[PDB]
Amino acid sequence: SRLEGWLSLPVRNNTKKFGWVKKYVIVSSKKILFYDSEQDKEQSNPYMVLDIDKLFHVRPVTQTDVYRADAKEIPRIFQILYANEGISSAKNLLLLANSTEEQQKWVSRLVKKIPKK
Secondary structure, three states, X not given: OOOEEEEEOOOOOOOOOOOOXXXXXXXXXXXXXXXXXXXXXXXXXXXXXXXXXXXXXEEEXXXXXXXXXXXXXXXXXXXXXXXXXXXXOOEEEEEEOOOHHHHHHHHHHHHHHOOOO
């Protein structure tokens, strides 16, 4: 197996605000997969997929990343930058970890898998 589990992503529960939602994220060898449930995974229905090699840099977030969030959640949330169109446009992905340790593993593992570390 490899880096996999449930990470929280900013979801619009109201309309403009963005809370969290545990989605099944699984970083495959030199690849990143995103799912919403096991039923979708077994059916080969990847909600999202990113290229590890495309990643520019993976590092933890800070209080500046979110305001409504919690100072305790900040250290449990990491950000992953990846090229979407070119370079400067490269977007990022915010993922919250139920435990700080998870953020250290997810980031360290997913980043370690990156070729341009």
